[PDB]
Amino acid sequence: EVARAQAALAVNISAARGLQDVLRTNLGPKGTMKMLVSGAGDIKLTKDGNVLLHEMQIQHPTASLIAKVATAQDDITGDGTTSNVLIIGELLKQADLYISEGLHPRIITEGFEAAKEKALQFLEEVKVSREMDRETLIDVARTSLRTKVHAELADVLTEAVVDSILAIKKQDEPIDLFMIEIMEMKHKSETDTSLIRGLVLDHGARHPDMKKRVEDAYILTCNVSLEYEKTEVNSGFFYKSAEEREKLVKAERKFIEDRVKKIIELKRKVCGDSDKGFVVINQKGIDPFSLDALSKEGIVALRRAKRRNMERLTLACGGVALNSFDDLSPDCLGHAGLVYEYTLGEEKFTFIEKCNNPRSVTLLIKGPNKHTLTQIKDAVRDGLRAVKNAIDDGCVVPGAGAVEVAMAEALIKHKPSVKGRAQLGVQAFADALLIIPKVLAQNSGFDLQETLVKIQAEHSESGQLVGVDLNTGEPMVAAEVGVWDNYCVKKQLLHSCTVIATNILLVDEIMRAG
Amino acid sequence: NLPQLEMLKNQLDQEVEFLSTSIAQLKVVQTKYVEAKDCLNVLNKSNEGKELLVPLTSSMYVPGKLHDVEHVLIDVGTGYYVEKTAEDAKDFFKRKIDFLTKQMEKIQPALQEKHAMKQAVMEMMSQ
Amino acid sequence: RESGRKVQSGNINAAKTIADIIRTCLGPKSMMKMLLDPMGGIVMTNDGNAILREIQVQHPAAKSMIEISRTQDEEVGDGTTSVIILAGEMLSVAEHFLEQQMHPTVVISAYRKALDDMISTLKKISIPVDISDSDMMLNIINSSITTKAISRWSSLACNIALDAVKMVQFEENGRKEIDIKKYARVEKIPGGIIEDSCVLRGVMINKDVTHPRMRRYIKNPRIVLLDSSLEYKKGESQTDIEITREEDFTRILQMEEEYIQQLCEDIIQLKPDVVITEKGISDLAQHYLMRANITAIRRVRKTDNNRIARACGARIVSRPEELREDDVGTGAGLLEIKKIGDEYFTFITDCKDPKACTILLRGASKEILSEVERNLQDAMQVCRNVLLDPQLVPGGGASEMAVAHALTEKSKAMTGVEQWPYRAVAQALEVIPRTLIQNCGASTIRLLTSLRAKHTQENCETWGVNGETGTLVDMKELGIWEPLAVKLQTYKTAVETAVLLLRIDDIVS
Numbered sequence A: 001e002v003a004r005a006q007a008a009l010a011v012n013i014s015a016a017r018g019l020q021d022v023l024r025t026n027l028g029p030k031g032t033m034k035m036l037v038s039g040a041g042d043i044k045l046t047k048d049g050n051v052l053l054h055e056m057q058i059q060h061p062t063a064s065l066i067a068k069v070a071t072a073q074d075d076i077t078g079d080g081t082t083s084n085v086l087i088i089g090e091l092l093k094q095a096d097l098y099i100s101e102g103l104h105p106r107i108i109t110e111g112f113e114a115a116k117e118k119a120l121q122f123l124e125e126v127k128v129s130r131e132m133d134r135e136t137l138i139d140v141a142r143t144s145l146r147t148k149v150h151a152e153l154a155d156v157l158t159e160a161v162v163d164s165i166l167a168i169k170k171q172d173e174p175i176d177l178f179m180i181e182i183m184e185m186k187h188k189s190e191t192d193t194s195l196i197r198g199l200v201l202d203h204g205a206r207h208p209d210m211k212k213r214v215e216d217a218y219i220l221t222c223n224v225s226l227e228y229e230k231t232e233v234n235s236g237f238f239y240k241s242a243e244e245r246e247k248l249v250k251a252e253r254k255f256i257e258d259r260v261k262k263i264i265e266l267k268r269k270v271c272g273d274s275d276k277g278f279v280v281i282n283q284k285g286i287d288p289f290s291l292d293a294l295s296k297e298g299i300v301a302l303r304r305a306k307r308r309n310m311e312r313l314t315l316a317c318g319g320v321a322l323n324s325f326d327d328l329s330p331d332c333l334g335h336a337g338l339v340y341e342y343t344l345g346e347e348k349f350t351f352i353e354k355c356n357n358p359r360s361v362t363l364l365i366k367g368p369n370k371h372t373l374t375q376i377k378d379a380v381r382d383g384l385r386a387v388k389n390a391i392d393d394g395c396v397v398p399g400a401g402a403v404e405v406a407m408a409e410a411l412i413k414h415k416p417s418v419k420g421r422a423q424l425g426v427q428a429f430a431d432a433l434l435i436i437p438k439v440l441a442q443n444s445g446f447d448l449q450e451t452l453v454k455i456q457a458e459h460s461e462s463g464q465l466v467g468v469d470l471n472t473g474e475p476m477v478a479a480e481v482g483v484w485d486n487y488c489v490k491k492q493l494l495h496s497c498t499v500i501a502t503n504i505l506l507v508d509e510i511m512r513a514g
Numbered sequence B: 001n002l003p004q005l006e007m008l009k010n011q012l013d014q015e016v017e018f019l020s021t022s023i024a025q026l027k028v029v030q031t032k033y034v035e036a037k038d039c040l041n042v043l044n045k046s047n048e049g050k051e052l053l054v055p056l057t058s059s060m061y062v063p064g065k066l067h068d069v070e071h072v073l074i075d076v077g078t079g080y081y082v083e084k085t086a087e088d089a090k091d092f093f094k095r096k097i098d099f100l101t102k103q104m105e106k107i108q109p110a111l112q113e114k115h116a117m118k119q120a121v122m123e124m125m126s127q
Numbered sequence C: 001r002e003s004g005r006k007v008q009s010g011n012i013n014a015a016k017t018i019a020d021i022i023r024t025c026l027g028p029k030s031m032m033k034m035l036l037d038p039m040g041g042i043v044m045t046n047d048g049n050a051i052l053r054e055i056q057v058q059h060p061a062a063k064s065m066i067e068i069s070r071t072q073d074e075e076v077g078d079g080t081t082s083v084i085i086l087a088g089e090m091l092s093v094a095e096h097f098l099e100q101q102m103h104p105t106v107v108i109s110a111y112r113k114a115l116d117d118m119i120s121t122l123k124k125i126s127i128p129v130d131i132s133d134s135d136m137m138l139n140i141i142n143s144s145i146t147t148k149a150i151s152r153w154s155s156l157a158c159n160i161a162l163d164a165v166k167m168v169q170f171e172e173n174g175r176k177e178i179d180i181k182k183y184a185r186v187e188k189i190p191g192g193i194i195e196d197s198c199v200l201r202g203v204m205i206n207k208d209v210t211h212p213r214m215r216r217y218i219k220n221p222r223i224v225l226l227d228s229s230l231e232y233k234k235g236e237s238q239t240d241i242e243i244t245r246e247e248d249f250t251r252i253l254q255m256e257e258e259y260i261q262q263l264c265e266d267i268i269q270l271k272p273d274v275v276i277t278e279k280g281i282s283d284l285a286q287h288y289l290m291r292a293n294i295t296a297i298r299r300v301r302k303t304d305n306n307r308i309a310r311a312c313g314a315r316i317v318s319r320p321e322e323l324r325e326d327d328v329g330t331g332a333g334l335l336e337i338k339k340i341g342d343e344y345f346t347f348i349t350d351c352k353d354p355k356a357c358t359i360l361l362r363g364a365s366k367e368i369l370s371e372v373e374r375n376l377q378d379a380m381q382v383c384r385n386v387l388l389d390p391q392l393v394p395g396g397g398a399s400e401m402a403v404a405h406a407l408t409e410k411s412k413a414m415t416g417v418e419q420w421p422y423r424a425v426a427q428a429l430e431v432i433p434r435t436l437i438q439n440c441g442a443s444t445i446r447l448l449t450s451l452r453a454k455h456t457q458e459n460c461e462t463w464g465v466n467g468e469t470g471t472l473v474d475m476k477e478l479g480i481w482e483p484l485a486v487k488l489q490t491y492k493t494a495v496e497t498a499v500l501l502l503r504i505d506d507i508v509s
Helices: A005-024 A049-055 A061-076 A083-101 A106-110 A111-125 A134-147 A151-171 A244-248 A251-272 A288-295 A309-314 A370-391 A402-413 A422-444 A447-463 A487-505 B003-045 B086-105 B107-124 C002-021 C048-054 C061-075 C080-100 C104-124 C134-144 C154-167 C246-269 C283-291 C300-309 C366-389 C396-413 C420-442 C444-454 C484-503
Strands: A002-004 A182-186 A193-196 A199-201 A221-224 A278-282 A299-302 A320-322 A338-346 A349-357 A362-367 A396-398 A466-468 A475-477 A484-486 A509-512 B051-057 B060-066 B072-076 B080-086 C033-036 C042-045 C198-200 C204-206 C335-339 C344-348 C358-360 C391-394 C463-466 C473-474 C482-483
Touching: A002 A005, A005 A049, A005 A061, A005 A083, A005 A182, A005 A422, A005 A509, A005 C033, A049 A061, A049 A083, A049 C396, A049 C420, A061 A083, A061 A487, A061 C042, A083 A106, A083 A422, A106 A487, A106 C420, A111 A422, A111 A487, A134 A151, A134 A370, A134 A484, A134 C061, A151 A193, A151 A370, A151 A396, A182 A193, A193 A199, A199 A338, A199 A362, A199 A475, A221 A309, A244 B003, A244 B107, A251 A288, A278 A309, A278 B072, A288 A299, A309 A320, A309 C204, A338 C080, A362 A370, A370 A487, A396 A402, A396 A487, A396 C396, A402 A422, A402 A447, A422 A447, A422 A466, A447 A466, A447 C335, A475 C358, A484 A487, A487 C484, A509 C104, A509 C246, B003 B072, B003 B086, B003 B107, B051 C204, B072 B086, B080 B086, B086 B107, B086 C335, C002 C048, C002 C061, C002 C080, C002 C420, C033 C048, C042 C048, C048 C061, C061 C080, C061 C484, C080 C104, C080 C420, C080 C484, C104 C391, C104 C420, C104 C484, C134 C154, C134 C366, C134 C482, C154 C198, C154 C358, C154 C366, C204 C358, C246 C283, C246 C366, C358 C484, C366 C482, C366 C484, C391 C396, C396 C420, C396 C473, C420 C444, C420 C463, C444 C473, C482 C484
Parallel strands: A182 A362, A221 A278, A221 A320, A278 A299, A509 C033
Antiparallel strands: A002 A509, A193 A362, A199 A349, A338 A349, A396 A484, A466 A475, B051 B060, B072 B080, C033 C042, C198 C358, C204 C344, C335 C344, C391 C482, C463 C473
C-alpha cells in the first residue's frame, strides 16, 4: 500500500506529534514517568526518549526510524533523547506550513542547514566553558537526573555519580566503562543508593565464617579448581573407562589439597596471621572442606565467580589470576584496603572496597527490587554518560530553554542568509527550537508566550542564560539554577534533529512491500 | 558406563583376527586352483602313461599309469564335476581364483578397518 | 494474456510510475523515497535498482523495465534510474497520441532519428578529455562520486580510480576496444586507512591466496599457471591401477614421481619457486615441488590463475612439454606474500605487458575500506568509461536542452508525422531538469521556458539548469561532466527501451 508525496509526508509528520507529545515532559524534573505493561506485555517504568522507543514494540516506521538514530544520542549522552524528539516533529510542523501554503520540499530541507550551522555556530557562540568540579558535576548530575527522577532522587544518586567519575577523572579517562559497576539490593525502599569505590561480590562462599571481615584484601582471582572434585571423577569427570576411573580417584583431593595447601601456604605467606584479611575467589566450585581448611586459616575463599567480576577484581584491586595458588607474595594479589563481606537479605554480598587503584567504582542501590529498582538504575546511568560528557566537553551550558530562544533568536532575529529562501528553511528550522521550554513551562504552568517573551527579553535584557522553573513555568537563570546542557549533548541532538528531518521530508512515496 | 568402552575394544580386535584368517584362507583356497592348473601342464609334458603316484588314503599312496591328459576335472556346481579339456580346466581354476580374488581382496579393507576402530575404542579406553 | 491499447496504456501506465519516484531521488540534491516492507521493514534510498526490488512487481513490462534497468545496472548501474526516465518520457508522450494516431511505427522510426541527432549533437555537445591528464579526469570522478554524496575517502579513491583503470586498460580488437575490468583487482584489507591505498602491478592475489608456503616473496622466480595436467601419471604417461595393496604402492607411486618432475622440470625449465597448481593438482605434485623446494600453491582457483593470467599478463599452459616464462609467468615479474593488515596477500606484479597495476585498498579496516571500494568501484568504472569515451559533456539541461531544438528543428524541417515524435522527443530531455528544478526546488515551467531561451541564443551548449547550483548555468564553468557515452548510454537505452515496449501490444502466458 502506497501514499505519495504530500500524502507520504503526512503519515510521517502526522505520526510525530502524538508520539512526540508524550515526551513533552521527558526532560528536567517535570518529566512524567511512563509505564509499559504493554511493551513486551510486561509491567515496567521508564522515562527516556530513545529507550521508551525501543521498549515499546513500536509499529510505525516514523516511530521506528528515529529510534535508530535516536539510539545514537542515547548511546552518546543517554538523555536528550529524552528531549530531541520534541524539536523534530515541531520542525516537521514548520516545513509543511510552507508546502501547505506550497513551497518546494527541497528548498525547505535545503534552508535548514546554514540554519543548522548558524545555530550550531550559535552553539559555539553560546557554549559556556565551565571548569568541572564535583559541585558543577553535582548540578550536572542533578540536571540529567531531574530529567530522570525526583531531584530528591537525584540527590543520593548525585553523590555516587560525581564521586565514581571522580576516581575516573584521576584515571584521566574522559569516558567511563568502569566505575559503571552498579549494584541492586533487597530493600523495602529504592531510596538507598550506595557507593563502593571498590567492588561488590555477588556470590558468597558455600562456607560462611571464613574471614567475614577481610581488612587487608589480597585477592587472587582464581579460575583454579579447588574443587577438582572429591570422589571418583576421572579427568575431573565421569567417563566410560573404569581403567582410567580406577587410576583417577585419588589425585582429585590431592590436586585439591594441593590447591588447599597452595592457599594454606599462600594465606600464611600472604598473612602469617588471620589478622590481615585474605580472599580467594574461584571462578568455579570449591570444595567446602578445602574451604573448611581455609576458612579456619583467615581466608575468605570464594567460588564460582563471574569472569566479569574477576576483571574489576583483577583491575580495581590490581588483582591477579592463576591456575595454581602455589604461593604468591602477599602483595602479589590485588588489594582493597577494606573488604566488607555483607549480607542483606540472605546473601552475603562481599564489598571488596577501595580496591587499590580502583578503575571501577561500585554503586549499590537497595530497593523493593521492582522495575522501581530498575527506574533508579537506568536513571543515574545515562546521567553518568551525561556527566561524563562534562568531562568530555569543558563547555556545559544550562538547559531549561535558556539556550533555545537566544539560539532561535539570532537566526530569526535576522535571516542568517537574509534569504527568504533559507529563511524559509530557517524560519521553519530556527522555530522548532523553542518546543522544549515552552511546553515544559506550560506543562508546569502559564502559557509559553509569557516565559517566551520573558526568556527572550530576559536574554535580550540579560544575555545571561535564563531558563524555566521546570515545575513552575517561570524563567530563572539556568546556569545558576544548575539545569545544564553539555555542549556535547545539545549540539549532537541538534544535528540529530535536523539530519533525520531532511530525507524523511524527502519521502515522496512509501510502498508497503519487500 | 565403564564396561561399554571396555566392550567394543577387544570386540573389534577379533574381526581383524577373523578377516585376516579369511583372507589368509582365501589366500589359501586360490593357491590350489593353479595347482589344479599347473599339474595339467606336467601331465601334458611327460606323457599319458607315466607312472603317477597319487595318495590312496591316510599315509597311503597309490600308483597308476597316466592317461587322458586332455580329460581333466573342474569341480563346480554343488556336488557336480565337469571334466574339461586341458585348456578348459585351467581356465575355471583361473576363474574361481578370480571369483575368490575380490572375495579374498575386500577382506583386508574389512580386515584393516576393524583394528583402528578397536584402537579408536582403545584410544577412548586410556582416555 | 494482455492486449493492445491496454498494453499500450499499461505501457504508458506502468512506465509512467516506473519512470517517476526515483527522480525525486535523483540529483545530488534528491528526495529519498521511503520503502516499507509488508512486515514493516523500512528503506531509504535514491537507488531505483534498489527501489525496483522491495516494491511488489506484477506488470510484466515493468519486469521488462527491471530488465533493461538491470541490463543497464550491468552496464553502469548509475542512470538505470535515468534511463527508465526517458523511456517513461518517450512511451508517455508520443505513444497514446500516435497510437490513437495509429502507429507504434512512425514512433519507432523517429527515435532512430531521435537517437542520431543527439548522437550527432553528443559529439558536438560532449567535448574530448585528457585521459592523459588524470586531473582532467579527476574532476569527473570528483563529480562522479558526489551525487550520492560520498567524498571523504573517495577524494583519494578518485585518483586511485584514475591510476589503475588506465593501466587495467589494455585491450584490443585491433580497433582497440577496452572493456577490461577483471584486470583491475581490488583488496579488502584490515587496517591502514581509507586515505592510504594504491594500485600494485600485475594482479595482486588477495582473495583466495593467503597461502603462507608460497614462500613469501619471489624476487625473480616465476609463477606457474598450470593447464597442465600436472596430475601424476601412475604409469609411464598414464594412471595405473589404484593402491589397494603394498605392491601397488611401490611401483605406481614411483611412476607418479616422474610425470610430476618431468613436467615440474619443464616447470623448472622456466625456473619458478611459486607454482600455483590448478589443473593436474596432485598430492605428489606439490610435494615434489615442495621436495623441489618449489612452493606449489594448490587448493587454488583458476580465477586466481586468471587473476594471475593478468598478474603476469600471461596465459595458463596445457602444454606438458617445455614450460616457458612466456607460457606462464610472462615477464620478469614478482610474486610476494604481503601482509596488509596481517592478511597474507600474494602480490604478483610486473606483468610482461605494461599498464600493469591492480588496486590495493586499505581502509582503517575492511568496512571503511569497503566504503572506499564501493565508491571507488563507481570511481574506477567512470574511468574506463572516460577511457571508453574521451568526450564529455556539460551536463544537466545543457545536455538536455541542446538536441530538442535540432530535434524540433528536425521535426519542423522533417514535418512528417515523424515530426510528432521529435516533438514528443523534444521536452523529454527536460524531465531531469525538472528533477534538477526539483533538485534546486524551484519553478520548472519558468526555468524550462527560461532554459528554452537559454538554448535560443546560447543554444544551451553548456547551459542547463543545475538544481545543485539551482540555476540555468554554463555546465562547463560549473563543471558538470560525464564521458559522452554515459550520456548516450543512458540516452541509447531509453530509446530502445521505449521502442521495446513500443513493440508490445501482447502479453501472453
